[PDB]
Ligand binder design. Sequence first.
Ligand SMILES: *[C@@H]1O[C@H](CO)[C@@H](O[C@@H]2O[C@H](CO)[C@@H](O)[C@H](O)[C@H]2NC(C)=O)[C@H](O[C@@H]2O[C@@H](C)[C@@H](O)[C@@H](O)[C@@H]2O)[C@H]1NC(C)=O
Ligand SMILES: *[C@@H]1O[C@H](CO)[C@@H](O[C@@H]2O[C@H](CO)[C@@H](O)[C@H](O)[C@H]2NC(C)=O)[C@H](O[C@@H]2O[C@@H](C)[C@@H](O)[C@@H](O)[C@@H]2O)[C@H]1NC(C)=O
Lengths: 242, 243, 242, 243
Amino acid sequence: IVGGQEAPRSKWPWQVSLRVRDRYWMHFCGGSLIHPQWVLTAAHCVGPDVKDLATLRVQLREQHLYYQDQLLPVSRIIVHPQFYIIQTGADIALLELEEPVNISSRVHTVMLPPASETFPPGMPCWVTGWGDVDNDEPLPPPFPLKQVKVPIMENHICDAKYHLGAYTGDDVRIIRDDMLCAGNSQRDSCKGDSGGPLVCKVNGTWLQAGVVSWGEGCAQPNRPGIYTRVTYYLDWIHHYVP
Amino acid sequence: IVGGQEAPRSKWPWQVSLRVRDRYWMHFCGGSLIHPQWVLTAAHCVGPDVKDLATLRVQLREQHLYYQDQLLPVSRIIVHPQFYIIQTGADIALLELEEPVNISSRVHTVMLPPASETFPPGMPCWVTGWGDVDNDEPLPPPFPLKQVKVPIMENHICDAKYHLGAYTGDDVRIIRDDMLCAGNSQRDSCKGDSGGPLVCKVNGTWLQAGVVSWGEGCAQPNRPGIYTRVTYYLDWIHHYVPK
Amino acid sequence: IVGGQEAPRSKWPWQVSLRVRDRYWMHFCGGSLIHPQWVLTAAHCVGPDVKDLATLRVQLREQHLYYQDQLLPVSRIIVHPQFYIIQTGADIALLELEEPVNISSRVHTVMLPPASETFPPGMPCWVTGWGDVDNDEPLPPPFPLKQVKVPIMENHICDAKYHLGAYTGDDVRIIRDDMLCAGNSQRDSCKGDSGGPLVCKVNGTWLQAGVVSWGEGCAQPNRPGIYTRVTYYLDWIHHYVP
Amino acid sequence: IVGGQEAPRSKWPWQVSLRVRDRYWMHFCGGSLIHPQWVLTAAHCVGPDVKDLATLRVQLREQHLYYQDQLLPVSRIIVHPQFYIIQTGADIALLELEEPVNISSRVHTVMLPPASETFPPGMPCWVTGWGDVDNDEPLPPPFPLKQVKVPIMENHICDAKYHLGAYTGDDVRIIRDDMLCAGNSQRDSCKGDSGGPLVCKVNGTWLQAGVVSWGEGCAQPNRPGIYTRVTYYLDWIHHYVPK
Ligand SMILES: *[C@@H]1O[C@H](CO)[C@@H](O[C@@H]2O[C@H](CO)[C@@H](O)[C@H](O)[C@H]2NC(C)=O)[C@H](O[C@@H]2O[C@@H](C)[C@@H](O)[C@@H](O)[C@@H]2O)[C@H]1NC(C)=O
Ligand SMILES: *[C@@H]1O[C@H](CO)[C@@H](O[C@@H]2O[C@H](CO)[C@@H](O)[C@H](O)[C@H]2NC(C)=O)[C@H](O[C@@H]2O[C@@H](C)[C@@H](O)[C@@H](O)[C@@H]2O)[C@H]1NC(C)=O
C-alpha cells in the first residue's frame, strides 16, 4: 500500500493473506473472506498454471503479518477459465477452505455488491494489504496491515489515461469492461497487495467493488491501479459460493 | 541463447544490438537490419510507453558486445499500434537510423519472407543474440554473439502445449495467428534475445521468419519460445520500409 | 543460530537485541544484560570506528523481534582499546543504558564467571540469538529468538583445526588466549548472532563463558565459532560495571 | 581504480589478471609479472586456505579484460607463512607459471626495488587494475585497464590517520612496518584491484613499491589504501624467484 496508514484493528475483518511454502510460509498476495469457507482473490496469484495445493496456505486477518499465524490449508482452487494474463481480464479466483472459519466481529465476510452498482467516481473506497509501501520498498517489520483511500476513475477516462504517453492506438482498448480503476500518484496498492480487496462504502455498508489486479507501477502518474470488477463475475462466483 | 554456440564471424551480418543509456551503453535487446536504414525489432523492447530516443543507440553486427562499438542514434521509432503486451501480439517495431549504413559482406540486410511462407515444422531455423545462456544466467564476457538451431512447432500444437497444466480454457487462444513457435527444452532464446531474429534457410536462402517475442521461461519443457510471425506484418512493414 | 530451536519464553532473560536506525530499527547484533544498566556485546558490533549513538537502540528480551519493541537509548559505548579487528582479539564492548532496567524473572542479568573457570570440552553450553539459520539464510519472520547447544573445543585443539588446509604457519597463532571455541558442523551461531552470549550451566548455575565474535563460516567443518573469552576481560569489565 | 583513467596501451606491461573458475574465468585480483615465470600478488587473493590450482588461471596484460584471453595455468602457489588476515601483514604470495612467458615491449617484468628504497611522501606512484571505479560501482564493459596516481603517506602519519575517529588505542599499531600507505579521498584502488601493483618512478625507472592489500573503503577520508611493502619481503621473494 502506497501513501496509506496502518489499519485500526477493528477495520477490514475480511482481509486475508495468501502464503506460499518457501523456507517459511511467505506472504505473496492478499484475498478477502466472502463466505465462511471461501476466499476471493486474483487468478494471477494462483495461476494460470495449476499449482500443488500443498504449497499454499491462507491466513485470516492479523494486525501484524506473521506474528499470530494460524495457517489454513485450501481444499480447492477455482480459477476463471478465461484467465491467462492480467491485461486480458478475468483475473479472479476462488479458494475453498478445508473448513468453514469462525465468524466474529474481528473476522468475518465482506458483502459482494449488487449487479447494478457501478461504483462511479466520487465513491469513497479503500484498498488494503501488506504489500510494498512504494516501488521496491517493502513494508517494514512488524508488518502492519495498511489501508489507503483511493479515488475511482471512470473506465473510459482511465482507458484514455493509459494511452497517454503510449504508442498503442486509441481504438485499442487497454482497460476492459470487467475492470475498474482506482488510485492516483500518491495513493495506490503495490507489490504484495495483489488479490486483496478494494471496498467502497455505499449507504453505510461496505461492498467489495474490486480485486487488486494490475498496474504499470505503484502510484504512477496517469496509470491508476486496475482491479477486477467484482460485479462482472457475480454469476461465476455464485456458481461455487453459497 | 540457451544451448547454442558462439557464431562464426561471417554469420548473421544483419544482427544488431540495441543499447540503453546506463553506466555504459548496455545491451537490452536484439534487432535485425532489414534495409540499410531500418532495424526490425520487437515493440516490447521499446514500448508500449514512449521513451526518450536520447537514451537509445543501435550497434550493428559485432562479434563481442562492447569491444568495438560504433553506436548509431535512432531517428525515429514506429511501434505497431495494436501492441500493448506481448501475449496479445503485434509485438513488432521499426527503428529508422539517421542514415543508411554501408552494406558489406560483413554487415548487410536479411531478406523478409514472401507472404506465403508458413515455416512449417522440420524447417531448419536459427535464433541469434547476446541474451542469457540460461534462466538467470547472463552471457559471460567477452559476450560473443551466440546462435542456436530451434525446432519449429505448428501453431495449434503449440497452443495446445501452452494449455497443458493450466486453468486456461481451451476456447482461450494463447498462441495467436501472428505468432510462431520455435524451441524446446534444450535450445531456445532467453532474456536479452528479445527483438532479435529467427531466420530460416528456405531453399538455399536465409529468410527472417520471426522476431523473438516472449515465452514462459528459457528452454522450459512444453513451452516453446514465441516469435512474432513476420509474414503477418509484411504490409505494415512495407508501409514504412522501401521495397 | 544454526541447527537450533526456538527458545522457550522463560529462557535467556538476559538476551538483548541491538538495533540500527534504518527503514526501521533493524537488528544487527546480540548482547547480554550483565547489570541492570549495562549490556555486554562484541566490539566489532559497534567499532572500531566511532558511530553516532543516535543511530543505536537496545531491545531487551523479547520472544519475536520487532513485534513488541520497547527500544532503549544508549548513554555510552565503551570499546576495549586493544580492539581493531576480530582476529586479533579484545572483541568486547560495554553499552551503558540511560536508566537501570527493571529486573524481573522475565528480564534479568546473567552472571559472569569467576576468573578460574576455563569452560573445558564436555561442558554443556548454549549460544542464543536472532542470527541467520544458515549461511546466507536469514531467520524467518516472526523472528523467534533461537538457541543451540554447542560443543566446546579446547583452544590449542581449535588452533590446530584452523591451520588444517591453510598456508598459515604453525608458529602463527590463530586462536588467542582471550578466545574460546565452540560449535561444530551441525550447531553454531551465524550472521546476526555476533555480540550475543555463550552461556554454560556450571554446577547448577548459568555463567556467560563467551561473546559471539567470529569464525570462517556458519557450522563449517573444522572451523568452530570463535568467542571472546569473558574471564579474560573480567578486570576490564569491572572497571566500568559495578 | 577510483579517480583514474584508462591506461595507454604501452603502460604497465607487467600487469596481470588472476581468474577463478566460475561459469567463466572470472577476474578477482591483480598481480604483476616479476620474472618470466613468476607472478607477484597478495596472499589474501589465494589464501590463507589452500586452493585447488585447477580453479586458477593467470592472464597477462590486456588493454580490455576478457577480450583477448590466453589463460595460463599455475604450477605452484607460494603464500607467505606469516599470513592469516590482511590486517596482520605478510599479505604477499607468489605464483609460478607452468611455463616462462615470452618477453616483449608489450609484456615484460617490473623491477623490484633495492632494499634501501623507502618511497617517502612526494614520490610519483601509480596503482593499476580492473577493479571497481567506486564503492559498489564495477568497471563497465569493455573493461579497460585503469591507472591512477596516488600520493604516498608516511607510515606514522598513516597510522595516526587510521586511529582518527576510532576507539582503538594510540599505542595499538594499525599500520605495520611491512605496510605502505597511498591514496586520498579521490584516488585509490577498489574491489578487484587487490593483489595488483603500486609502482613508483625512481630516477627514470619503474620499481614495484607495493602490492594492493587492504583498506577501509575505496578512496575514503583518513583511510588511505594499504599496500604490502615489497622491500620488506625481498629475502623471501629471492628464496623462490631467480636473479
Ligand atoms: C472455532 O469456534 C469453535 C466454537 O467456539 C471452537 O470450538 C470450541 O473450542 C473451545 C476451545 O477453543 C471449546 O471450549 C469448545 O467446546 C469448542 N466447541 C466446539 C463446538 O467445538 C474452535 O476451536 C477449535 O476446536 C476445539 C474443539 C479445539 O479442537 C481447538 O483446539 C480448536 O481451536 C474455534 N476454532 C476453529 C474451529 O478454527
Ligand atoms: C612465444 O614466442 C614464439 C615466437 O613468437 C611463438 O612461436 C611462434 O608462434 C607463431 C604463431 O603464434 C608461429 O607462426 C611461429 O612460427 C612460432 N615461431 C616459433 C619460434 O616457434 C610461441 O607460440 C607458441 O609456440 C608456437 C610453436 C605455436 O605452438 C603457438 O601456437 C604457441 O602459442 C610463443 N609462446 C606463447 C605461449 O605465446
